[PDB]
């Protein structure tokens, strides 16, 4: 169904709120972790959540240390240098909080 689709699972750090081109977003760092071999590779993905409602819902519920499943589009935004991030915005993207214990 999706030409561009990403699915990540990991841990939330660095929750921040702000504005891109006036558009409202909350952003956080998501850290996936893939595992004489034993390949143990970390990857700290930048997640961007867009939407007037959506951005606030994330900031109010998602908290430092949470585990989440994230679903969205891989995109590249520069300014001389290119920035890799992940675009989450309903109904295409999703942040799904996973509750332990």
């Amino acid at each position, epitope marked *: 169904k999706s030409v561009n689709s990403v699915t990540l699972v990991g841990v939330v750090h660095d929750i921040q709120s702000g504005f891109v081109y006036e558009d409202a977003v909350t952003q956080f760092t998501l850290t996936t972790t893939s595992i004489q071999e034993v390949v143990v590779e970390k990857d700290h993905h930048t997640i961007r959540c867009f939407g007037e409602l959506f951005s606030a*819902e*994330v900031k109010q*519920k998602v908290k430092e240390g949470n585990v989440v499943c994230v679903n969205g589009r891989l995109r590249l935004s520069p300014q001389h240098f290119y920035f890799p991030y992940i675009q989450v915005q309903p*109904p295409h993207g999703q942040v799904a909080v996973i509750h*332990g*214990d």
Partner: nanobody
Amino acid sequence: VQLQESGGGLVQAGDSLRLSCVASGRAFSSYGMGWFRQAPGKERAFVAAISRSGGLTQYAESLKGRFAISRDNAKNTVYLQMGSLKPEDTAVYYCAGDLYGLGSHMENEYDSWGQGTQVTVSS
């Protein structure tokens, strides 16, 4: 804000089963919705939730990947897709509403509640 579960009953272990919660009034589109459950004798436990905008969902760790929550504001309805059943999933399933439009794993944070439906898995 009224709430009514529909689609319980009994079904053979290994089966999927879709549930439905219908909300009366035109406020549904603003309500965070949630699904909780309760097996005979035990406490009522969280299962899934979905925010107003529908982009922020939430899941019980174990009961994740098998279950999927979604909404259709058009029909003022919230659904629960239960992939692959098991005897332990036998319980009475409730739907709940969140005025503040977030959903939570903490039931006490929900203002509205359903009558509850009766899922009963075989074996």
